[PDB]
C-alpha cells in the first residue's frame with residue numbers, strides 16, 4: 001500500500017479541516033449552558049448542557065463534511081441523507097477520541113471530565129451509557145491518531161447503505177478512496193502490523209450497533225417526555 | 239502472503255460447510271412444503287422451519303471452527319445467539335438470483351419479495367434483505383470468502399454478554415488475516431476487495447437491528463416463533 | 474423530500 | 489446465565 005502525494009495532501013487537509021472546524025465553534029461552545037444538587041432544575045441544566053454539546057458537534061460534523069472531496073458534488077438530498085444517519089456515529093467516534101483510560105471518563109470541555117454517572121445525570125439511560133464507554137475503552141486500545149480518526153469519520157459518512165441514498169454508486173466510490181487512503185496511511189504508521197488497518201475498519205461494525213442502541217435512547221426520551229432541541233430532534237426523532 | 243496453515247484452515251472450513259449441508263439434507267426434506275388461514279400458516283411454517291434447519295447448520299459449522307469449542311459454552315451461546323441471523327443473511331445473499339431478484343432456497347424453487355411477504359415478514363425487513371443481497375451479489379464472493387466472513391461474524395468480541403472478549407477477538411483476527419491473504423490471491427490486482435468484504439459486516443449489523451423490529455412486529459401480530467427461533471430471537 | 478424535513482441541517486449546509 | 493435460557497441451543501452444542 002503505497003501512500004501517494006494525492007492521498008497525503010488529502011489526509012493533511014482533513015486533519016487541518018477538523019482543526020479549523022473546531023476553532024469556528026469555539027464561541028458557540030462558550031455559551032453552552034453551564035454544568036451545574038438534586039432538583040428537577042439541576043437535571044434539566046445537565047440535559048441542556050449535554051444536548052448543547054451535541055448541537056455544536058453536529059455543526060462541526062456538517063462543516064467537516066463540506067470539506068470532504070466529492071461530498072458537495074452529491075445532491076443536497078444525498079448530503080442530508082448521509083449526515084442525518086452518520087452524525088451519531090461521528091459523535092461516538094469523537095467521544096472515544098476524548099476517553100481517559102485511568103478514570104474511564106470523557107473529557108469534553110477542557111478542565112472537565114465526564115464519567116458514567118455524569119452521563120446518567122445528564123439524562124442518558126445505562127443501556128446506552130455502558131456500550132458508549134465499552135466502545136470507547138476498545139477504541140482507546142487502538143491508539144488512533146488525528147489522521148486515522150479523520151479518515152474513519154469520512155468512511156462512516158460515505159456509507160452507501162444509509163436509508164434514502166440515491167447515488168449509492170458514487171457514495172461507495174467516494175468511501176473507497178478514503179478506505180485506500182487509510183490502508184496506505186496505516187502502512188506507514190504501523191508497518192509491522194497488517195492487522196491495524198482491518199481492526200480500524202472493524203470498529204465501524206461496532207458503531208452500527210451503537211447507532212441502534214442510540215435509536216432506543218431517543219425513543220425512551222419520548223416516554224420520559226424529555227424533548228430534544230430542534231436540530232437533534234430533526235435528525236434523530238421519528 | 240498465504241501460508242500453508244491458512245490455506246489448510248480455509249479448505250477445512252469450505253469442506254466443513256459442505257459436510258454440514260449434507261448432515262441437514264434429510265431435515266430440509268421433512269420441512270413443511272410451500273402451499274386462507276391454512277395456507278398462510280403453512281407458508282410461515284415453511285419459512286421458519288428453513289430457519290430452524292439453518293440454525294442447526296450454523297451451530298454444526300461453528301463447532302468445526304478452530305478455537306470455538308475451547309470457549310466456554312456460555313460464550314459459544316453468546317456468539318451464536320446474535321450472529322445466527324447475520325449468518326442466515328449471508329446464506330440468503332449467496333442464493334440471490336440477480337435476473338429475477340429472487341432467493342433460491344430449495345433447489346427447484348426461488349422466492350421473491352412477494353413470497354417473503356406471504357410467508358409473514360414485513361416490507362421494512364424484506365426490502366433491506368433484497369437490497370443487501372443485490373449489493374452482495376455484485377461482490378461475487380466464492381465459497382472460501384463466504385466461509386471466512388461467516389467465521390469472522392461469529393467471532394465478534396462485541397456481542398452482548400461475551401466474557402472472553404480477548405480470546406474471541408484473537409480468534410477473529412486469524413480469520414481476518416487469512417481472508418486478507420486469500421483475497422490477495424483471488425483478486426491480486428484489486429486491494430479494495432478485502433476491505434469491501436469487511437464492510438458488508440457493517441451492513442449486516444444494521445440488518446440485524448431491522449430484524450429485531452421484525453421479531454417485535456410478530457409480538458404485536460401474536461405470530462409466535464417456533465421454540466428454537468423464539469429462544470434465540472425473542473426478548 | 475428529506476431536504477424539506479431537515480431545514481436546520483439544510484441551512485447549515487447552505488452556509 | 490444465558491445457558492439456562494437457551495436449552496435447545498445448548499443441546500445442539502452438546503450434540
Ligand SMILES: CCCc1c(OCCCN(C)C(=O)Nc2ccc(C(=O)O)cc2)ccc2c(C(F)(F)F)noc12
Pocket residue numbers: 022029050051053054057091092094095107108109110123124132214217218221228232
Ligand atoms: C455522547 C453520545 C452523543 C450524545 C451527546 O454528546 C455530547 C458530547 C458531544 N461531543 C462529541 C462533544 O461535545 N465534543 C467536544 C469536542 C470538542 C470540545 C472542546 O474543544 O471544548 C468539547 C466537546 C449528547 C446528547 C446525546 C443524546 C441525547 F440527546 F439523546 F441525550 N444522544 O446521544 C448524545
Ligand SMILES: CCCc1c(OCCCN(C)C(=O)Nc2ccc(C(=O)O)cc2)ccc2c(C(F)(F)F)noc12
Pocket residue numbers: 259266285286288289292326327329330342343344345358359367449452453456463467
Ligand atoms: C432471510 C432472513 C432469515 C429468516 C428466515 O430464513 C428463511 C431461509 C433460511 N435460510 C437462510 C436458508 O434456509 N438457507 C438455505 C441454505 C441451504 C439450502 C439448501 O441447500 O437447499 C436451503 C436454504 C425465516 C424466517 C425469518 C424471520 C421471522 F421468522 F422472524 F419471520 N426472521 O428472519 C427470518
